[PDB]
Design an enzyme around this catalytic site. Structure first.
Site, PDB file in Angstrom:
ATOM      1  N   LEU A   1       0.806  -1.218   0.000  1.00 18.37           N
ATOM      2  CA  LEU A   1       0.000   0.000   0.000  1.00 18.37           C
ATOM      3  C   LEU A   1       0.839   1.268   0.000  1.00 18.37           C
ATOM      4  O   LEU A   1       0.436   2.269  -0.598  1.00 18.37           O
ATOM      5  CB  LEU A   1      -0.946   0.022   1.210  1.00 18.37           C
ATOM      6  CG  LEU A   1      -1.995  -1.090   1.270  1.00 18.37           C
ATOM      7  CD1 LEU A   1      -2.869  -0.929   2.506  1.00 18.37           C
ATOM      8  CD2 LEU A   1      -2.842  -1.111   0.009  1.00 18.37           C
ATOM      9  N   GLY A   2       1.988   1.259   0.660  1.00 17.49           N
ATOM     10  CA  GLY A   2       2.816   2.451   0.674  1.00 17.49           C
ATOM     11  C   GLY A   2       4.180   2.149   1.243  1.00 17.49           C
ATOM     12  O   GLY A   2       4.422   1.080   1.812  1.00 17.49           O
TER      13      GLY A   2
ATOM     14  N   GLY B   1       7.651   4.445   3.141  1.00 14.38           N
ATOM     15  CA  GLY B   1       8.139   5.670   3.733  1.00 14.38           C
ATOM     16  C   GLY B   1       9.527   5.463   4.294  1.00 14.38           C
ATOM     17  O   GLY B   1      10.121   4.393   4.123  1.00 14.38           O
ATOM     18  N   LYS B   2      10.064   6.478   4.969  1.00 19.39           N
ATOM     19  CA  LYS B   2      11.410   6.356   5.508  1.00 19.39           C
ATOM     20  C   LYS B   2      11.484   5.366   6.660  1.00 19.39           C
ATOM     21  O   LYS B   2      12.565   4.828   6.926  1.00 19.39           O
ATOM     22  CB  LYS B   2      11.926   7.725   5.960  1.00 19.39           C
ATOM     23  CG  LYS B   2      13.156   8.186   5.198  1.00 19.39           C
ATOM     24  CD  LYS B   2      12.890   8.211   3.700  1.00 19.39           C
ATOM     25  CE  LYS B   2      14.187   8.217   2.904  1.00 19.39           C
ATOM     26  NZ  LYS B   2      13.943   8.157   1.434  1.00 19.39           N
ATOM     27  N   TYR B   3      10.360   5.081   7.320  1.00 24.43           N
ATOM     28  CA  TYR B   3      10.364   4.274   8.531  1.00 24.43           C
ATOM     29  C   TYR B   3       9.703   2.909   8.387  1.00 24.43           C
ATOM     30  O   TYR B   3       9.860   2.080   9.289  1.00 24.43           O
ATOM     31  CB  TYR B   3       9.671   5.033   9.672  1.00 24.43           C
ATOM     32  CG  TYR B   3      10.425   6.256  10.127  1.00 24.43           C
ATOM     33  CD1 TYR B   3      11.809   6.246  10.214  1.00 24.43           C
ATOM     34  CD2 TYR B   3       9.753   7.424  10.458  1.00 24.43           C
ATOM     35  CE1 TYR B   3      12.506   7.363  10.624  1.00 24.43           C
ATOM     36  CE2 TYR B   3      10.440   8.550  10.869  1.00 24.43           C
ATOM     37  CZ  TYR B   3      11.818   8.514  10.951  1.00 24.43           C
ATOM     38  OH  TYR B   3      12.513   9.630  11.361  1.00 24.43           O
ATOM     39  N   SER B   4       8.954   2.659   7.315  1.00 24.80           N
ATOM     40  CA  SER B   4       8.236   1.390   7.209  1.00 24.80           C
ATOM     41  C   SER B   4       7.722   1.199   5.788  1.00 24.80           C
ATOM     42  O   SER B   4       7.761   2.108   4.958  1.00 24.80           O
ATOM     43  CB  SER B   4       7.064   1.319   8.186  1.00 24.80           C
ATOM     44  OG  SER B   4       6.076   2.274   7.818  1.00 24.80           O
ATOM     45  N   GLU B   5       7.247  -0.017   5.519  1.00 23.90           N
ATOM     46  CA  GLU B   5       6.418  -0.321   4.364  1.00 23.90           C
ATOM     47  C   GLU B   5       5.107  -0.900   4.870  1.00 23.90           C
ATOM     48  O   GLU B   5       5.086  -1.623   5.871  1.00 23.90           O
ATOM     49  CB  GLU B   5       7.085  -1.326   3.406  1.00 23.90           C
ATOM     50  CG  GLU B   5       8.287  -0.792   2.641  1.00 23.90           C
ATOM     51  CD  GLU B   5       8.740  -1.749   1.547  1.00 23.90           C
ATOM     52  OE1 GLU B   5       8.634  -2.982   1.745  1.00 23.90           O
ATOM     53  OE2 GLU B   5       9.189  -1.269   0.483  1.00 23.90           O
ATOM     54  N   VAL B   6       4.018  -0.609   4.170  1.00 24.48           N
ATOM     55  CA  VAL B   6       2.681  -0.961   4.629  1.00 24.48           C
ATOM     56  C   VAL B   6       2.013  -1.817   3.562  1.00 24.48           C
ATOM     57  O   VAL B   6       2.095  -1.513   2.369  1.00 24.48           O
ATOM     58  CB  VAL B   6       1.850   0.295   4.951  1.00 24.48           C
ATOM     59  CG1 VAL B   6       0.409  -0.066   5.239  1.00 24.48           C
ATOM     60  CG2 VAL B   6       2.435   0.963   6.153  1.00 24.48           C
TER      61      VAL B   6
ATOM     62  N   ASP C   1       1.439  13.855  14.897  1.00 22.47           N
ATOM     63  CA  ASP C   1       1.463  13.760  13.441  1.00 22.47           C
ATOM     64  C   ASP C   1       0.041  13.762  12.904  1.00 22.47           C
ATOM     65  O   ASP C   1      -0.291  13.020  11.976  1.00 22.47           O
ATOM     66  CB  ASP C   1       2.231  12.515  12.971  1.00 22.47           C
ATOM     67  CG  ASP C   1       2.691  12.608  11.516  1.00 22.47           C
ATOM     68  OD1 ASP C   1       2.794  13.729  10.959  1.00 22.47           O
ATOM     69  OD2 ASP C   1       2.970  11.539  10.928  1.00 22.47           O
TER      70      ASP C   1
HETATM   71  C1  LIG Z   1      -6.205   0.908   4.798  1.00 23.52           C
HETATM   72  O1  LIG Z   1      -6.439   0.743   6.172  1.00 23.52           O
HETATM   73  C2  LIG Z   1      -5.358   1.061   6.999  1.00 23.52           C
HETATM   74  C3  LIG Z   1      -4.283   1.817   6.555  1.00 23.52           C
HETATM   75  C4  LIG Z   1      -3.248   2.087   7.433  1.00 23.52           C
HETATM   76  C5  LIG Z   1      -3.309   1.605   8.739  1.00 23.52           C
HETATM   77  C6  LIG Z   1      -2.233   1.853   9.768  1.00 23.52           C
HETATM   78  C7  LIG Z   1      -1.111   2.530   9.623  1.00 23.52           C
HETATM   79  S1  LIG Z   1      -0.250   3.016   8.296  1.00 23.52           S
HETATM   80  C8  LIG Z   1       1.065   3.820   8.966  1.00 23.52           C
HETATM   81  N1  LIG Z   1       2.048   4.394   8.474  1.00 23.52           N
HETATM   82  C9  LIG Z   1       2.290   4.560   7.068  1.00 23.52           C
HETATM   83  C10 LIG Z   1       1.399   5.292   6.298  1.00 23.52           C
HETATM   84  C11 LIG Z   1       1.643   5.474   4.945  1.00 23.52           C
HETATM   85  C12 LIG Z   1       2.789   4.929   4.388  1.00 23.52           C
HETATM   86  C13 LIG Z   1       3.669   4.215   5.182  1.00 23.52           C
HETATM   87  C14 LIG Z   1       4.925   3.599   4.618  1.00 23.52           C
HETATM   88  C15 LIG Z   1       3.437   4.037   6.526  1.00 23.52           C
HETATM   89  N2  LIG Z   1       0.988   3.768  10.490  1.00 23.52           N
HETATM   90  C16 LIG Z   1      -0.372   2.976  10.928  1.00 23.52           C
HETATM   91  O2  LIG Z   1      -0.728   2.787  12.042  1.00 23.52           O
HETATM   92  C17 LIG Z   1      -4.379   0.856   9.177  1.00 23.52           C
HETATM   93  C18 LIG Z   1      -5.403   0.587   8.299  1.00 23.52           C
HETATM   94  O3  LIG Z   1      -6.504  -0.158   8.705  1.00 23.52           O
END
Ligand SMILES: COc1ccc(/C=C2\S/C(=N\c3cccc(C)c3)NC2=O)cc1O
EC number: 2.7.11.1
Length: 328
Positions: A43-44, A46-51, A154
């Site tokens: 899904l995405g 960033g500098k600290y994680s991948e989701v 944030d």
């Molecule tokens: C689509 O539903 C969800 C979407 C995100 C989350 C939880 C996240 S996502 C996050 N951090 C990021 C956000 C964007 C990009 C990157 C790399 C990290 N921190 C959280 O807790 C939970 C969900 O149910």
């Protein structure tokens, strides 16, 4: 030196909690079964994680997996402890599990899944009623975490997941969140540029929950005026100049003089002199259906230079702007 500051609410919540509540460096992580979760789609990044979107094969339910990039163990423990402390709270994203990813060699946080719509598309469609409703839902999350001794640090549209079909909202991404301790000096390199409070931009470190209320006001301004982001700075110095062109320079000087703060001398060439503006200047025919006297007064009471002068989350929930929102 700088004059100290305290939160005006929830000041001593962590002092009287048991130490284990806020002493996250001592937290012992309870690990789940990594094979319970099959990754489906990235899904995405960033500098600290991948989701990732994933499936929990013990219940065939969608979950979201955040695989942390290498960062210091205390920051991982801080986010985990905060998520565990807040679990079950109103509109707080639920940490379902924590597992060791075998490829990254780092923790992977497993969250409940929200079937959300992108804010760049959602903000085009929200009605006046929608904005009030979802603002109230965000405030429930912020009053909860503040009442639990935690500042999010944030708050921004990207961190508010909204499933518009079920009118469900979750505040996500607690990776910058911190425990509030009276008198503690915090890192000012938090929040995204457009949502950074004046305290961060003038390098005042003894800030508190009220930072989140500035960020919330920035979100509100962008929604009711249809200008996203509202304060659109090119860098962190221009960000403060953009704020000062709206709130004015005299009250900026009042703020830093109250806390015996000096501006970075690089502002001498860029800050100028600016009157405080009336919020009606940002109303026009394409946003006026989102604006009311209640909205402008509410916004005005969030966007204060002085962090001590902003509405608290609970005070904000009392505001007449929310009188039209159906209560549960
Ligand atoms: C689509 O539903 C969800 C979407 C995100 C989350 C939880 C996240 S996502 C996050 N951090 C990021 C956000 C964007 C990009 C990157 C790399 C990290 N921190 C959280 O807790 C939970 C969900 O149910």
């Amino acid at each position: 030196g700088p004059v100290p500051s305290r939160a005006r609410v929830y000041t001593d919540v962590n002092t009287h909690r048991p130490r284990e509540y806020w002493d996250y460096e001592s937290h012992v992580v309870e690990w789940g079964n990594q094979d319970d979760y099959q990754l489906v789609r990235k899904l995405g990044r960033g500098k600290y994680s991948e989701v990732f979107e994933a499936i929990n094969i013990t219940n065939n339910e969608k979950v979201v997996v955040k695989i942390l990039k290498p960062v210091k163990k205390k920051k991982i423990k801080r986010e985990i402890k905060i998520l565990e402390n807040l679990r079950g709270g109103p509109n707080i994203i639920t940490l379902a599990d924590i597992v060791k990813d075998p490829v990254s060699r780092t923790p992977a946080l497993v969250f409940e899944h929200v079937n959300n719509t992108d804010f760049k598309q959602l903000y085009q469609t929200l009605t006046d009623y929608d904005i009030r409703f979802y603002m109230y839902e965000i405030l429930k999350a912020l009053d909860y975490c503040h009442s639990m001794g935690i500042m999010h640090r944030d708050v921004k549209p990207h961190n508010v997941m909204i499933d518009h079909e079920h009118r469900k909202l979750r505040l996500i991404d607690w990776g910058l969140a911190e425990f509030y301790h009276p008198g503690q000096e915090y890192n000012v390199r938090v929040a995204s540029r457009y949502f950074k409070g004046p305290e961060l931009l003038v390098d005042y470190q003894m800030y508190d929950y009220s930072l989140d209320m500035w960020s919330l006001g920035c979100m509100l301004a962008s929604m009711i005026f249809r200008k996203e982001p509202f304060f659109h700075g090119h860098d962190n110095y221009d960000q403060l100049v953009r704020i000062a062109k709206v709130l004015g320079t005299e009250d900026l000087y009042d703020y830093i003089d109250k806390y015996n703060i000096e501006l970075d001398p690089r502002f001498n060439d860029i800050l100028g002199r600016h009157s405080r503006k009336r919020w009606e200047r940002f109303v026009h025919s394409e946003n006026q259906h989102l604006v009311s006297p209640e909205a402008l007064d509410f916004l005005d009471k969030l966007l204060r230079y002085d962090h001590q002068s902003r509405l608290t989350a609970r005070e904000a929930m009392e505001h007449p702007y929310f009188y039209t929102v159906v209560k549960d």
